Amino acid sequence: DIQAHYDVSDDFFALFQDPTRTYSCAYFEPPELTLEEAQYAKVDLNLDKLDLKPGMTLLDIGCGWGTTMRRAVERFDVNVIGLTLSKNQHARCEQVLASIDTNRSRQVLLQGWEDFAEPVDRIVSIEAFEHFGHENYDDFFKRCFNIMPADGRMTVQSSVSYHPYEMAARGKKLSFETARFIKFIVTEIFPGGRLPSTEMMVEHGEKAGFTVPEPLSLRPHYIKTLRIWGDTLQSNKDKAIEVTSEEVYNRYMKYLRGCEHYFTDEMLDCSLVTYLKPGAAA
Ligand SMILES: Oc1cccnc1Br
């Protein structure tokens, strides 16, 4: 109920996101890409790590509006299974996947990874991990390990914080201030969320039996992403307030400007972590 109060219509998000409605870090490689092109570049950055071969099945955990799954089918000629908890995203994904000219299997399930136990070749998860909760991390990596073959690979892209000990080292004043903003994100933007640390993402993966190379930082790309999101929301103030309220407009400008600030101050990061099964190709 208190959390439900923070429910926001998809129409609001459309007033600050690119036409694909991607609600995650873009990849500005090369630097001159538009937000929309950078969102396709981020999908490619993830898929290009997964050693995907024709006829494999890719699981997308938190499949959004289906952009990742569509690009995987079109680029790699693979079957796809998407998991989402959003009825609207589910509806859109079925139609996105049905639209694709292919013989490959395309499936979208209105459920979480907890209830998913089908064999898959590869797994991608782009900024859903912040919504799982710390106590679920061992079950998540065990599930992911067990449903993949000997050459399995997974990418998880997640916003991350630092252990309070690490935060204290970079200024106490800045340490408490960051913790408070994180509390705001996890209360008002992603209610019930939890930012993991990169160390947590890595060590939970290793405990489950994965090889974990050095994670890729997307920090500078998230700064560019949040700058464009904030500037776009600000340019649509009138329409955003009209579609929601002044409260919600102020909340999301605080979020977007705030994240840009703490990413620039290197008190937040965004990690793309690769998880390799022992039999993964070299
Ligand atoms: O299973 C979950 C949990 C949270 C967010 N998305 C998914 Br799919």
Side-chain angles (χ1 to χ4, degrees), residues 3-86 88-282:
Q3 302 230 309
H5 153 89
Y6 299 110
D7 285 28
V8 175
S9 80
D10 298 335
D11 298 1
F12 177 91
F13 291 101
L15 297 169
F16 78 71
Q17 292 167 179
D18 74 289
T20 68
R21 297 169 167 249
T22 304
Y23 194 19
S24 52
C25 192
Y27 187 57
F28 295 89
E29 217 53 84
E32 312 84 32
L33 296 179
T34 66
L35 178 58
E36 188 178 353
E37 294 167 323
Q39 293 292 22
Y40 286 109
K42 172 268 304 303
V43 171
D44 289 339
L45 176 67
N46 277 275
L47 294 184
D48 286 353
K49 293 161 171 295
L50 289 180
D51 179 40
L52 281 165
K53 299 185 159 76
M56 279 180 184
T57 299
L58 171 68
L59 179 63
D60 187 346
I61 305 178
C63 61
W65 301 106
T67 309
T68 303
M69 281 184 304
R70 180 186 173 190
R71 182 142 275 229
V73 180
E74 281 169 354
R75 283 195 58 211
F76 293 100
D77 185 32
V78 293
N79 309 293
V80 293
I81 301 170
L83 307 187
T84 182
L85 293 178
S86 159
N88 286 347
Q89 290 192 156
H90 173 95
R92 179 59 175 193
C93 285
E94 286 194 322
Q95 197 185 353
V96 167
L97 295 175
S99 298
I100 305 177
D101 195 2
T102 183
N103 293 165
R104 293 306 174 184
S105 185
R106 296 140 285 167
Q107 193 178 358
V108 57
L109 303 173
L110 187 69
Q111 65 174 225
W113 60 262
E114 293 98 333
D115 295 326
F116 187 80
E118 300 300 321
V120 297
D121 291 298
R122 306 295 191 261
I123 303 169
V124 61
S125 188
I126 300 160
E127 299 187 37
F129 191 80
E130 302 89 313
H131 311 253
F132 295 175
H134 285 194
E135 76 288 301
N136 273 251
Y137 288 167
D138 286 347
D139 291 352
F140 175 74
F141 285 106
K142 180 159 183 271
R143 177 60 54 82
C144 287
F145 194 88
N146 287 340
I147 66 173
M148 286 198 289
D151 72 343
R153 309 189 175 187
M154 174 164 66
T155 58
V156 182
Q157 182 181 309
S158 181
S159 285
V160 296
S161 61
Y162 298 93
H163 191 277
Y165 294 169
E166 192 154 339
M167 278 196 287
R170 318 137 103 94
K172 273 229 296 150
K173 176 169 189 291
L174 189 51
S175 175
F176 294 128
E177 185 196 317
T178 309
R180 284 184 279 271
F181 183 59
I182 291 169
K183 179 64 177 203
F184 156 77
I185 293 173
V186 150
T187 299
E188 298 194 28
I189 308 300
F190 304 124
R194 284 287 281 282
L195 292 187
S197 70
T198 300
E199 183 170 74
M200 285 183 83
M201 296 181 72
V202 174
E203 288 186 351
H204 282 284
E206 290 177 314
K207 188 179 209 271
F210 289 108
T211 303
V212 183
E214 183 168 32
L216 178 66
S217 180
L218 290 173
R219 163 180 288 143
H221 303 280
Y222 227 147
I223 295 169
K224 284 213 202 88
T225 300
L226 293 157
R227 168 53 67 110
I228 294 159
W229 283 350
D231 291 1
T232 309
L233 181 50
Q234 179 169 246
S235 83
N236 299 328
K237 178 167 151 68
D238 292 325
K239 204 56 156 64
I241 292 176
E242 186 185 339
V243 158
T244 60
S245 65
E246 203 174 314
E247 170 177 350
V248 174
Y249 172 80
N250 288 336
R251 170 169 303 119
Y252 275 85
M253 287 303 298
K254 166 172 190 180
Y255 173 61
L256 293 172
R257 295 312 190 201
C259 282
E260 187 182 348
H261 179 78
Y262 292 110
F263 272 102
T264 305
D265 281 13
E266 316 202 332
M267 298 302 296
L268 301 178
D269 195 10
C270 185
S271 298
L272 200 177
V273 184
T274 302
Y275 302 89
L276 303 177
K277 286 198 57 168

